[PDB]
């Protein structure tokens, strides 16, 4: 029909998954992070260093 | 409560945790907290033999896993008359 054009050469834009970094371990629960286990910031030695 | 127990550890995260368990366990009286020096902290407790035993065992096993934990803990059933100079 109406002559379109191709151009581009690279198709879809390179969208990055904002989720990345990781590297270290999330800061001892209580601030974010799902799943997991450990303790409700119990008096247990874990407490802060619950990990 | 002539029967005497005492909880000693390195740093007082376990010391106050154990003392909390002490008072938490029975009608025991915390008579003194002492800074040994070099990081050791001691907490004294007075009461009868059974109550002191329950308190000391509860606190010791509770505090063995917190931070750096207990160092040692035992009980005196019939403390000598020198306890008053000792406190």
For B70-85, give the secondary structure using H, E and C: EEEEEEECCCCCCHHH
Q: Which residues does chain B have within 8 Å of residue A51's beta carbon, measured at their own beta carbons?
A: none
Question: In this complex, which of B64, B66, B69 lies closest to A43 when CB atoms are compared?
Answer: B66
Task: Tell me the pairing of strands B29-37 and B3-10.
Answer: unpaired
* Dihedral pair phi/psi, residue B71, rounded to 5°: -115, -50
Q: How was this structure determined?
A: cryo-EM
Which residues 6+ apart lie within 8 Å of A8 measured at CB?
Answer: none
Structure tokens at B55: 């308190």
Does B11 touch chain A if contact means CB atoms closer than 8 Å? no
**Residue B53 is inside which H or E element, if any?**
helix B49-63
Tell me how crowded residue B44 is: count the other CB atoms within 10 A of its CB: 20
Radius of gyration of chain B measured on its C-alpha atoms: 12
Burial class from Cβ neighbours inside 10 Å (0-12, 13-18, 19+) for residue B40 reads: middle
Contact B8, B36 (CB under 8 A): yes
């Amino acid at each position: 029909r109406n002559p379109s054009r191709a151009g581009f050469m690279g198709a879809m834009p390179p969208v990055d998954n904002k989720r990345n970094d990781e590297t270290e371990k999330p800061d001892f629960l209580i601030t974010g992070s799902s799943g997991n286990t450990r303790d409700g910031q119990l008096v247990t030695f874990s407490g802060g260093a619950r990990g | 409560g002539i029967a005497l127990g005492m909880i000693e550890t390195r740093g007082l995260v376990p010391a106050i945790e154990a003392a909390d368990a002490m008072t938490k366990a029975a009608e025991v009286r915390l008579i003194g907290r002492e800074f040994v020096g070099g990081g050791y902290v001691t907490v004294l407790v007075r009461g009868e033999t059974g109550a002191v035993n329950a308190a000391v065992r509860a606190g010791a096993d509770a505090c063995e896993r917190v931070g750096d934990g207990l160092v040692a803990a035992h009980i005196i059933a019939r403390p000598h008359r020198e306890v008053e100079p000792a406190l």
